[PDB]
Design a protein around this ligand. Structure first.
Ligand SMILES: O=C(O)c1cc(I)cc(I)c1O
Ligand SMILES: O=C(O)c1cc(I)cc(I)c1O
Ligand SMILES: O=C(O)c1cc(I)cc(I)c1O
Ligand SMILES: O=C(O)c1cc(I)cc(I)c1O
Length: 581
């Protein structure tokens, strides 16, 4: 890295480089229009090229963040558009970058990416590069911690979507479901990555490593610990870089990691073969999403090393991180059936148990039961997975979301309704994602995914702290975030939001809404019902919401939708309150 920009440019190649720089900028400057960003990345890419041509050219030896940060800081109306980021631009690197990062907007609340399949295919044909670029921009700026290389990957998917659908007859129906599925994948990936970044940010790299160790151990149970460690080290670096906005380095290192992993796929997992026969983004993505390898038949019994060995305390004092790390690896690799956070909690408990036991007189007698300390850690979420998947399976996603929305509005009524609705909806999306899964997968799926949504909440909460319960759950141990949240009950301290009839007042407008947004409106109402009536049981809320849904469906099916809403809503608005006592 004589010229780090030349280096990244050469490594990544212009398409990916430009894409990542676009992502980077879009993420750092989420409000600057697409075209601004494009000129920004073109300038940066031109400069990258100039540097690759001659790495001794002036400023070519400046760091990527110096370079890009500078480019960002040159944007038109940086102070009017980003009064916060202005000050960042006053700052040198890495302070500047740290500032930009800090001012990343996790909830830019930009317009909903909705297909305009005619206009968009049009723009995809007019310039597919400007269109996929635009996509990178849109998604990136909506998700300023979106995993850059992954975004490029998704850009590829998105392209494929417009490649397949734009020529198609019902381009809209060929495309929208793809784009919808893609948004779900985006949202999920964004959340995954945001979690990673949040984890660095809020818990540090060790937390991320522990997480990755657990995860990768599950994913690559056959890989030995050194291997998982190496990959976790690298992957953590990749995520660290991506999260710290070092997207070129992140991508480059990710590519390297993918290469490494694929070079060692037999040392790592048989599930990689499909990933490693893919091109670089697709390969990386595939490894990132790779299904867990089969448990090896030679998984070591764990009691000997981790419970029975008489010098465990010695190992544990002598090499805490390595011993624990390997414990985590072992437990995790044998526990794809556990969420990562469960494995971490288990690791934490294993650690806590050595801490306890090893400070005790006969540590071996004490930690010999260590594996048994994990049991309640396992049962708690397994029980929730069952409780909630039962519920989900019983009531379906909407009502599950309602459930969650109620629960979370209860837990954190201070949270904006849109956020509760979002979180509860995403949380219910866990029901959909995880409850249908093979039973051994629901727990990992659901807790991992809840980690994402909770992190989302946390992330949103960072920006918009409204609840201390949220803060605590979000900032106390990450492994416990989900249990912390799950454990949250009705914030008793919450003064019920004053009643605003209007809030629960629907109008014919809701009828034009696609069912998702109709639901969201209802679910917002729902959150509001909770906020106003926090102690309303979830069942009262459900009935009231059912009443609202009923009235909404009715009045929407009405000849005069609005007369209907106007006549029936108020009574409903008033009565539903009595139903929430
Ligand atoms: O328009 C887009 O760029 C777009 C992008 C995604 I990701 C999802 C949907 I639905 C979209 O319409
Ligand atoms: O998710 C990722 O960012 C990721 C990327 C690569 I390359 C390898 C693994 I394992 C991952 O988990
Ligand atoms: O709502 C929960 O607290 C919850 C927790 C877990 I772990 C799994 C599922 I599915 C849930 O719904
Ligand atoms: O379907 C449910 O079980 C459900 C659960 C809760 I908690 C709140 C609402 I509204 C519901 O509709």
């Amino acid at each position: 890295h004589k010229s780090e920009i030349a280096h990244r440019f050469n490594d990544l190649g212009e398409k990916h480089f430009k894409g990542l720089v676009l992502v980077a900028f879009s993420q750092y400057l989420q409000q600057c229009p697409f075209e601004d960003h494009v000129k920004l990345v073109n300038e940066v890419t031109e400069f990258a090229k100039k540097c690759a041509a001659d790495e001794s050219a002036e400023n070519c030896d400046k760091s990527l963040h110096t370079l890009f940060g500078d480019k960002l800081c040159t944007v038109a109306t940086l102070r009017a558009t980003y009064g916060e980021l202005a000050d960042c631009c006053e700052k040198q690197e890495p302070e500047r970058n740290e500032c930009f990062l800090t001012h990343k907007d996790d909830h830019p609340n930009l317009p909903k990416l909705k297909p305009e399949p005619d206009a968009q295919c049009a723009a995809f044909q007019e310039d597919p590069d400007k269109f996929l670029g635009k996509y990178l921009y849109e998604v990136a700026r909506r998700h300023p911690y979106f995993y850059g290389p992954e975004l490029l990957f998704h850009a590829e998917e998105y392209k494929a979507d417009f490649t397949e659908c734009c020529p198609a007859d019902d381009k809209l129906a060929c495309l929208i479901p793809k784009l919808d599925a893609l948004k779900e994948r985006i949202l999920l990936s964004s959340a995954k990555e945001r979690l990673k970044c949040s984890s660095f940010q809020n818990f540090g790299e060790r937390a991320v490593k522990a997480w990755s160790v657990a995860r990768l151990s599950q994913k690559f149970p056959k890989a030995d610990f050194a291997e998982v460690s190496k990959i976790v080290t690298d992957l953590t670096k990749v995520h660290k870089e991506c999260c710290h906005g070092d997207l070129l380095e992140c991508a480059d290192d990710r590519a390297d990691l993918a290469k490494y992993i694929c070079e060692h796929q037999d040392s790592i997992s048989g599930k990689l073969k499909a990933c490693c026969d893919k091109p670089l983004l697709q390969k990386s993505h595939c490894i990132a999403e790779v299904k867990e390898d089969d448990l090896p038949s030679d998984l070591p019994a764990l009691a000997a090393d981790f419970a029975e060995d008489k010098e465990i305390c010695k190992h544990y004092k002598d090499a805490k991180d390595v011993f624990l790390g390997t414990f985590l690896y072992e437990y995790s690799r044998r526990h794809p059936d556990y969420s990562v956070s469960l494995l971490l909690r288990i690791a934490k408990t294993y650690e806590a148990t050595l801490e306890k036991c090893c400070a005790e007189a006969d540590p071996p007698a004490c930690y010999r039961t260590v594996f048994d300390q994990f049991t309640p850690l396992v049962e708690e979420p397994k029980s929730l997975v069952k409780k909630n998947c039962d519920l989900f399976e019983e009531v379906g996603e909407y009502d599950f979301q309602n459930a969650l929305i109620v629960r979370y509005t209860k837990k954190a009524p201070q949270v904006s309704t849109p956020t509760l609705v979002e979180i509860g909806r995403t949380l219910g999306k866990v029901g959909s994602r995880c409850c249908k899964l093979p039973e051994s997968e629901r727990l990992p799926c659901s807790e991992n995914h809840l980690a994402l949504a909770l992190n989302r909440l946390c992330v949103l909460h960072e920006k918009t702290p409204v609840s201390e319960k949220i803060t605590k759950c979000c900032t106390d141990s990450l492994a416990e975030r989900r249990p912390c949240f799950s454990a949250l009950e009705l914030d008793e301290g919450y003064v019920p939001k004053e009643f605003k009839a209007e809030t629960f007042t629907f109008h014919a407008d809701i009828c034009t809404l696609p069912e998702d947004e109709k639901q969201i409106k209802k679910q917002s109402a729902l959150a509001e019902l909770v906020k106003h009536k926090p102690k309303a049981t979830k069942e009262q809320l459900k009935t009231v919401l059912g009443n609202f849904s009923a009235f909404v469906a009715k009045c929407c099916g009405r000849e005069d939708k609005e007369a209907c809403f106007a006549e029936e809503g108020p009574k409903l608005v008033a009565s539903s309150q009595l139903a929430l006592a």
